[PDB]
C-alpha cells in the first residue's frame, strides 16, 4: 500500500444510506500551463469508500489540481434524480511542501460537503 | 426461428389516439434492468386539442435505502413515422424522481379492454433488445376477460419477453 | 419589525423545505433544569417564526430541539437521528437576531447560526 | 419567488453572511464551452438576486462558481478551495426555481439545492 | 483489536485549520431505564483526532446512546468565542445487532456537521 | 524634494549573508495595506552550506474573527544581482497562514546591532512604492544603542517612511 504516505487521497460518503459511497468515479485533473485541465489521475472508491495512490510525490507538483467526483452516477444507479452533475474540489497543492491532502466528501441527492485535511509530511 | 429484432415487431395498426385515452390499471410488467415501479401501477392517458398525448402514472417504487415512495410521474409524448410508436419524455412531480426519454410502443390494444406496451432502451448490435419493459394494461381493476387475455399472452411470445412477466397487486398504496 | 429567535429547516434528500417539523425551544434555567421555553411546526416555506419576544429573550443557555425522527418516520425512512439540538447561549452582548438553519438527511445533519445585531 | 436562479452564501466561521462574494454563473453551450452566463456580488443579506429571466434560463448544464478564496484572502487566512462550483442541469422539467445555498469555512464547504417548481 | 473492531468510534475534524481536531473530550452517554442519562464512556481524540475503543461488544447494549463532543473547550483554548455549547450525536444503537458505529464530526465556530456510518459486523 | 522612487534607494553594499545569520528582534514596523504581524515579531535567519538564506519568524496576528494567533512563518530567499536584495517565498507552519513573495531588501545593517528592512508590494506609476512594509531589527531585545539608533532614523527618512513607524512590544505572547 503506502507505509503511511498518501499525497492525494479521496474519501466519499453516503449521508442517505449511512455508509461508504462505494465505487464512485474520481477524475483528478491538473491544470496546466494555459488554463487546460490536463488529465492527471483517475479511480473507483473501495469497499471502505477510499480511492488511494493516485500519484507519487515526484508527480505531485505545485499546481491547481481538481478532484472531480462523479456523483450523478452514484445516484442515477440508485434511482433518485440528483441535483448535482458532479462534486469537484479544486485546490493548489504542494506550494509549502505539506504533501498530504485528504479530500473527504459527504453526499445526498441535493447537497454535498467537502473538507480537506492538509497534513504535513515530516516537514 | 422466432424473430426477436426490435425491427421485426408488428405494432398497432392505425392506433386511434383519442380511443386509448383514459385510466388503465397495469396488470403485468416485464422489468427492465434498473429501478422500476414495483407494483400498484395506474396510467391515465389524455390527448389535448393539438393532438398531443400526455399520460400520468402513479406507482410504488422502493427507492434504495428502502423507502417505498408512491411515485407520481408525468409522460409527454412525441409522435414518429408510425402512429403506434412514440418517444416519451417522463419525470416526477418530485424533483428527486427519475427523468428520461423512453420508448413507448403500443403493441396491440382493443382500447375498450386491454393493451401490451413495449419499450426497448438499449438495442443489441444484432438487433435484439438488450433491455425492455412491457406493461399489459386492463381497463378494469379486476383483471380482464380470458379471450383478450389469450390475445395478449400470444403477442408476448411474438415479442419474446415471455416468459418474463410478473403480477401487479393493486392494494391501494396510493 | 423583528424575530429574535427564528428557525429554518431543509430536506437534503428531496431538495425541499422540511415542512411541519416540530421544533421545541427550551431555556435552561436556574439549576440545570431545562425549563420549557417555546414550540412550533415549520411552515410551507420551512420556517418556524415569532417563537418569543425581545423582553422574553433574557440571556443565555437556550436550546432549540428539532424533531427530525418524526420527519423521517413520516416519510418511511429509518433515520439515524433521534432529533436535532442547537444549544446556544443567545442574548449576552444584546445582538438579538438569531436564525438557526438546519439541513437534514437520514444519517447526517448540519446546522448554522446567523446571529445578526439588531441596531446595536 | 420569481427568481429564476438564486444564490445565498454564509460564513460558517464568523456566523454571518459572506458579504461581497463574486458569484459567477456560466452556461455550458453546444461544444463544452462554458460560455459566460451571468455575474454578481452578494448583498448585505448574503444574496445575489436577479441573474436571468425565465426566457433567459434555458434547459442546459449551468454552473454557479463562487469566488471562495478572495473571500478568505481578504480576511487574511489561507483557505483551501480555489473557489466553489455548483454544476447542475436545469430547466428540463419546467420547475424554474433554483436556490443554491453554500456554507463557507477555510477547509470545508457545503452547498444545497432547493429546487422548487413555480406553479407547475 | 486489529483494524476496525471498535463498536462505537469518534472522529473530529477542524474545518478552520485544515486538520484533525486533537484532544476533544468526548463523553458517551447511555440513557438508561427512566430517562436518566447515565454516564457511559469518555475520552480524548488522538493525534489523528480519533477517540478509539470506548466500549466492548458485551457492554454496547441496545438503547439510546449519546456521544457528546466538548466543542467550546476546543474553541476556547484556540482564542475563538464559539457559538456552540457542545455537540451531541444521540442514537439508538445496537437493535438489529450491526455493531459498528463511527460518528465523524466537522467543526467550525458557528456550525458543525456530523455523519454516522453504521457498518454491520459480519451479519 | 526627496526621491522616493523605489528605484533610487541605496541598499547594503557587499551584504555578507553569513554575517546577517541569527536572531533579530523586530523593533518598529511600517504596516502594509492588509494583515500583518501586529507585535511580538522575532526573525531567525540562517544561511545553509549551498549559500541560500532562509528565515523563520514568530509573531502575533489577530486573525479577523478576532482570535489572536502566534504565527510561525518560514521564508526561503532567492538572490538577485544585488547581494542586498532578494525575493522571499513565505508561508506558515499551519496551512491556513499567509503565503507570498515579498521583496526583502536589507537597506542597511551593521550585522552586530541593526538593520532596516524594506519591501515594496505594489509600485505606483511614477515609481514611488504604493504598498510597503519595513522592520527595524535590533539584535538585543532591549532596543539598541543611540548611535545605531541615529543611523536608522536617518535611513528611515531616505526611504520616505519616516513618521510612519510604530513600536512593537515584546511581552511574551509566545
Ligand atoms: C411515464 C409513464 C410511464 C413511465 C413511468 C416510469 C416507468 C416511471 C419511473 C419510475 C422511476 C423508476 C421511479 C424511481 O424514481 C408508463 C408506462 C408508466 C405509462 C405512461 C407514463
Ligand atoms: C516570514 C518573514 C517575514 C515575513 C513574514 C510575513 C511577512 C508574515 C505574514 C504574516 C501573516 C499576514 C500572518 C497572517 O496570516 C519577515 C519579513 C519578518 C522576515 C523573516 C520571516
Identify the H or E element spanning A71.
helix A71-76
Taking the C-alpha atoms of residue C16 and residue C10, their distance in angstroms, rounded to an integer, is 6
DSSP code per residue over B130-151:
EEE-EEEEESSTT---HHHHHH
Taking the C-alpha atoms of residue C34 and residue E35, their distance in angstroms, rounded to an integer, is 14
Under 8 Å between Cβ of F116 and F104: no
Contacts of D108 in chain E (CB under 8 A): 15, 106, 108
Chain B closest CA to A34's CA: distance in Å? 38
Chain C closest CA to B174's CA: distance in Å? 14
CA A120 from centre of chain: 18
Cell of D4: 429564476
Q: Of the candidates D112, D3, D101, which has an alpha carbon nearest to the alpha carbon of residue D57? A: D3
The CA radius of gyration of chain D, in Å to the nearest whole number, is 14
B120: phi then psi, degrees, rounded to nearest 5: -105, 135
The position carrying cell 426566457 is D55
Q: Is A17 exposed, middle or buried (0-12, 13-18, 19+ CB in 10 A)?
A: buried
Under 8 Å between Cβ of A98 and A121: yes
The position carrying cell 456537521 is E113
Cell of C53: 419576544
Taking the C-alpha atoms of residue A64 and residue C60, their distance in angstroms, rounded to an integer, is 45
Taking the C-alpha atoms of residue D76 and residue D72, their distance in angstroms, rounded to an integer, is 6
Under 8 Å between Cβ of F139 and F22: yes
CA dihedral D79→F37→F99→F63, nearest 10 degrees, is 0
The position carrying cell 533610487 is F8
Taking the C-alpha atoms of residue F152 and residue F165, their distance in angstroms, rounded to an integer, is 12
Taking the C-alpha atoms of residue F2 and residue F92, their distance in angstroms, rounded to an integer, is 37
Whether D89 and chain A come into contact, CB under 8 Å, resolves to yes
DSSP code per residue over E79-94:
T---S-S-EEEEEE--
The position carrying cell 439515524 is C80
Resolution for the entry shown, Å: 3.1
Site to probe by mutation for ligand 1, drawn from B26, B89, B98 as the one with most ligand atoms within 8 Å of Cβ, is B98
F158: helix, strand or coil: helix
CA dihedral A7→A8→A14→A19, nearest 10 degrees, is -30
Taking the C-alpha atoms of residue A90 and residue D104, their distance in angstroms, rounded to an integer, is 15
Beta strands at B129-132 and B120-123: parallel, antiparallel or unpaired: antiparallel
Under 8 Å between Cβ of F133 and F31: yes
Taking the C-alpha atoms of residue A91 and residue B110, their distance in angstroms, rounded to an integer, is 62
B20: helix, strand or coil: helix
Strand partners, F107: none
| Residue F108 CB less than 6 A away from ligand 2 | no
CA dihedral C52→C54→C57→C58, nearest 10 degrees, is -160
Q: Of the candidates A20, A63, A62, A59, which has an alpha carbon nearest to the alpha carbon of residue A41? A: A59
Cell of B50: 393539438
Under 8 Å between Cβ of F140 and F112: no
The CA radius of gyration of chain E, in Å to the nearest whole number, is 14
Q: Nearest chain B residue to D96 by CA: give it.
A: B95
F138: helix, strand or coil: strand
Nearest to E90 among C82, C110, C112 (CB): C82
The per-type count for chain F, helices as H runs and strands as E runs, is 1, 11
CATH number, residue F93:
2.40.128.20
Beta strands at C34-41 and C47-48: parallel, antiparallel or unpaired: unpaired
Q: Is the dihedral of CA D92, D97, D103, D104 positive or negative?
A: positive
Q: Of the candidates E42, F137, D86, which has an alpha carbon nearest to the alpha carbon of residue A88? A: D86
Under 8 Å between Cβ of A28 and A52: no
Cell of E27: 463523553
Strand partners, D98: D115
Tell me the CA–centroid distance for residue D70 and ligand 2, in Å. Answer: 20
F32: helix, strand or coil: coil
Strand partners, F96: none
Under 8 Å between Cβ of D113 and D100: yes
Q: For F54-79, b where at least 16 C-beta lie within 10 A, e where not — what string?
A: ebbbbbbbebebebebebebbbbbee
Q: Give the residues surrounding ligand 1 with Cβ less than 6 Å away.
A: A 79; B 35-37, 43, 55, 57, 61, 71, 73, 75, 90, 97-98, 117, 135
Under 8 Å between Cβ of D56 and D4: yes
Taking the C-alpha atoms of residue E97 and residue E94, their distance in angstroms, rounded to an integer, is 5
User: What is Dmax (Cα atoms) for chain E?
Assistant: 46
D9: phi then psi, degrees, rounded to nearest 5: -140, 140
Give me the domain span that covers residue A54: 1-123
Strand partners, D23: D40, D66
- Please give, one letter per residue, the 3-state secondary structure of D56-72: CCCCCEEEEEECHHHHH
Under 8 Å between Cβ of B72 and B56: yes
D96: phi then psi, degrees, rounded to nearest 5: -60, -10
The CA radius of gyration of chain B, in Å to the nearest whole number, is 15
Under 8 Å between Cβ of B136 and B145: no
CA A65 from centre of chain: 10
Taking the C-alpha atoms of residue F98 and residue A123, their distance in angstroms, rounded to an integer, is 17
B152: phi then psi, degrees, rounded to nearest 5: -70, -25
Taking the C-alpha atoms of residue F106 and residue F15, their distance in angstroms, rounded to an integer, is 8
B158: phi then psi, degrees, rounded to nearest 5: -65, -15
Q: Do A106 and E116 touch (CB under 8 A)?
A: no
Under 8 Å between Cβ of E92 and E120: no
Q: Do E18 and F96 touch (CB under 8 A)?
A: yes
Cell of B124: 443489441
CATH number, residue A85:
2.60.40.180
Strand partners, F57: F43, F73
Contacts of C116 in chain D (CB under 8 A): 16
Nearest to F65 among D14, D78, D80 (CB): D14
Under 8 Å between Cβ of B102 and B121: yes
Whether E109 and chain F come into contact, CB under 8 Å, resolves to yes
Taking the C-alpha atoms of residue B149 and residue B146, their distance in angstroms, rounded to an integer, is 4
F18: helix, strand or coil: helix
In the PDB record, what is the listed experimental method? X-ray
Q: Do D89 and A85 touch (CB under 8 A)?
A: yes
Q: Is the dihedral of CA B18, B22, B28, B31 positive or negative?
A: positive
Helix, strand, coil tally for chain D in percent (to 5): 5, 45, 50
Domain count, chain B: 1
Q: Is A4 exposed, middle or buried (0-12, 13-18, 19+ CB in 10 A)?
A: exposed
Cell of B17: 389516439
Cell of F1: 524634494
* Number of Cβ atoms within 10 Å of the Cβ of A52: 15
* Number of Cβ atoms within 10 Å of the Cβ of F21: 16
Identify the H or E element spanning B58.
strand B58-63
Taking the C-alpha atoms of residue B59 and residue B26, their distance in angstroms, rounded to an integer, is 10
Contacts of D108 in chain F (CB under 8 A): none
Taking the C-alpha atoms of residue A67 and residue F61, their distance in angstroms, rounded to an integer, is 33
Whether D93 and chain B come into contact, CB under 8 Å, resolves to yes
Q: Of the candidates C71, C70, C57, C95, which has an alpha carbon nearest to the alpha carbon of residue C16? A: C71
Taking the C-alpha atoms of residue D101 and residue B124, their distance in angstroms, rounded to an integer, is 44
F132: helix, strand or coil: strand
The position carrying cell 425549563 is C35
Sheet of E25-31: strands edge to edge?
Answer: E37-44, E25-31, E64-69, E87-92
Cell of F119: 519591501
A residues 6-65 lying closer than 8 A (beta carbon) to C: 14-18
Give me the domain span that covers residue F153: 1-174
Identify the H or E element spanning E71.
helix E71-76
Contacts of D112 in chain C (CB under 8 A): 10, 12, 15, 103
Q: Of the candidates B96, B137, B130, B131, which has an alpha carbon nearest to the alpha carbon of residue B114? A: B137
Q: How far is CA F96 from CA E17, E114, F34, F93, F173, in A?
A: 6, 23, 16, 9, 20
Taking the C-alpha atoms of residue D34 and residue D26, their distance in angstroms, rounded to an integer, is 6
Domain count, chain C: 1
Amino acid at each position: 500500500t503506502g507505509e503511511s504516505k498518501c499525497p492525494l487521497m479521496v474519501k466519499v460518503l453516503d449521508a442517505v444510506r449511512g455508509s461508504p459511497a462505494i465505487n464512485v468515479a474520481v477524475h483528478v485533473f491538473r491544470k496546466a500551463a494555459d488554463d487546460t485541465w490536463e488529465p492527471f489521475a483517475s479511480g473507483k472508491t473501495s469497499e471502505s469508500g477510499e480511492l488511494h495512490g493516485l500519484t507519487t510525490e515526484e508527480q505531485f507538483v505545485e499546481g491547481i489540481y481538481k478532484v472531480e467526483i462523479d456523483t450523478k452516477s452514484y445516484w442515477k444507479a440508485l434511482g433518485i434524480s440528483p441535483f448535482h452533475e458532479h462534486a469537484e474540489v479544486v485546490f493548489t497543492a504542494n506550494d509549502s511542501g505539506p504533501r498530504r491532502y485528504t479530500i473527504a466528501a459527504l453526499l445526498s441527492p441535493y447537497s454535498y460537503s467537502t473538507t480537506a485535511v492538509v497534513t504535513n509530511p515530516k516537514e | 426461428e422466432r424473430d426477436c429484432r426490435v425491427s421485426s415487431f408488428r405494432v398497432k395498426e392505425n392506433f386511434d389516439k383519442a380511443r386509448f385515452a383514459g385510466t388503465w390499471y397495469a396488470m403485468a410488467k416485464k422489468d427492465p434492468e434498473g429501478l422500476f415501479l414495483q407494483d400498484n401501477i395506474v396510467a391515465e392517458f389524455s390527448v389535448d386539442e393539438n393532438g398531443h398525448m400526455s399520460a400520468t402514472a402513479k406507482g410504488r417504487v422502493r427507492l434504495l435505502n428502502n423507502w417505498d415512495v408512491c411515485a407520481d410521474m408525468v409522460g409527454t409524448f412525441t409522435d414518429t413515422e408510425d402512429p403506434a410508436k412514440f418517444k416519451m419524455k417522463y419525470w416526477g412531480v418530485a424533483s428527486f424522481l427519475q427523468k428520461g426519454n423512453d420508448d413507448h410502443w403500443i403493441i396491440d390494444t382493443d382500447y375498450e379492454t386491454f393493451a401490451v406496451q413495449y419499450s426497448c432502451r438499449l438495442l443489441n448490435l444484432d438487433g435484439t433488445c438488450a433491455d425492455s419493459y412491457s406493461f399489459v394494461f386492463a381497463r378494469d381493476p379486476s383483471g380482464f376477460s380470458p379471450q383478450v387475455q389469450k390475445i395478449v399472452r400470444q403477442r408476448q411470445e411474438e415479442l419474446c419477453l415471455a416468459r418474463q412477466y410478473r403480477l401487479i397487486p393493486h392494494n391501494g398504496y396510493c
